[PDB]
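Archive maintenance. Older records in this collection stored only the sequence; we are now back-filling the structure field for every entry so that each record is complete. The fields below show one back-filled record exactly as it appears after the update. Entries are processed alphabetically, and Sensor protein FixL is next in the queue.

ARCHIVE ENTRY
Title: Sensor protein FixL
Organism field: Bradyrhizobium japonicum
Length field: 117
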Amino acid sequence: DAMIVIDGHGIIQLFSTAAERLFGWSELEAIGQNVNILMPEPDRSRHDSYISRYRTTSDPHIIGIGRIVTGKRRDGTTFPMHLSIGEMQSGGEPYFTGFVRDLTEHQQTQARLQELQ
Ligand code: HEM
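Back-filled structure field:
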């Protein structure tokens, strides 16, 4: 599926081919950016504090739990996606990985089934 690796500051370090397809950003364009470019407001402006709160309390809200959220593509379109966050260490500093599963089709079929009674 789509995978993203960021450093302890939310800056994208690695961006898989499938993440490019899904988000609309090539790997080169993404790598120097904050991960928040992939999400809409209010999460966007709050993501850095989500990361900071975790590094300070060590209390996970998504790590080891998973969560369905709304992500944002480059063209502006938003979409539902499941997210799993993993924690890793490299060169003494923390890095996090995000495995993403696009749930757009699921949301569509569900919504479609409901509108037909
Ligand atoms: C792109 C759509 C994304 C959205 C909407 C999103 C949203 C959120 C939200 C809502 C929180 C926790 C807020 C709370 O419950 O306290 C959070 C935590 C965090 N996110 Fe994301 N996130 C996104 C993607 C990512 C990705 C791709 C990564 C890593 C590659 C990531 C790294 C983190 C980390 C490290 C935390 C804190 C972990 C924790 O609280 O357990 N996020 N994110």
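Update note: The CA atoms of residues 12 and 32 lie 6 Å apart. The domain at 1-117 is CATH 3.30.450.20 (Beta-Lactamase).
Entry marked complete.
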